[PDB]
Design a protein around this ligand. Structure first.
Ligand SMILES: [N]
Lengths: 141, 29
């Protein structure tokens, strides 16, 4: 039953300047059936298939260099080394303002206790976290 | 396309558990 299948959708906190902290947005509708947000990470409560996804927005006023490397990744940690599940790399520069989105999505086999994270490499360029478009979610199929 | 859709979905405050699933796997349709 879909009611029993866990779900989690967290969104970046905009007031946490300089980093990418996840917050549940007081989601009392997302019937998390075990999934928890601990240490900025999602912990899987059950073994099975899960849809893991995440999106980040980057923003910059002008190009200082030409080697602006923005990356977004999703990792898994089981027995307390992290393993990358999904990753992406963008380079917007070759003061004109710019933006670059990075969405990640995939289906993976998880076991109970896994700890999923979604990390970036330039939290300074993170922006638009108040529109709900910077997110990180889990759906048990 | 998918990206902006999941985001929008995540913000709808009058969406049930059942409904949020449906529209995520909707976006992913
Ligand atoms: N679709």
């Amino acid at each position: 039953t879909p009611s029993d299948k866990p779900v989690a959708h967290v969104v970046a906190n905009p007031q946490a300047e300089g980093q990418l902290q996840w917050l549940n947005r007081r989601a009392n509708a997302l019937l998390a059936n075990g999934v928890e947000l601990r240490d900025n990470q999602l912990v899987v409560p059950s073994e099975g298939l899960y849809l893991i996804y995440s999106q980040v927005l980057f923003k910059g006023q002008g190009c200082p260099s030409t080697h602006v490397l923005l990356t977004h990744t999703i990792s898994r940690i089981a027995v307390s080394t992290k393993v990358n599940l999904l990753s992406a790399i963008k380079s917007p520069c070759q003061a004109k303002p710019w933006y670059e989105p990075i969405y990640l999505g995939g289906v993976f086999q998880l076991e109970k206790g896994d700890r999923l994270s979604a990390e970036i490499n330039r939290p300074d360029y993170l922006d638009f976290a108040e529109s709900g478009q910077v997110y990180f979610g889990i759906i048990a199929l | 396309x998918l990206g902006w859709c999941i985001g929008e979905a995540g913000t709808d405050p009058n969406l049930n558990h059942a409904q949020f699933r449906a529209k995520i796997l909707x976006c992913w349709x």
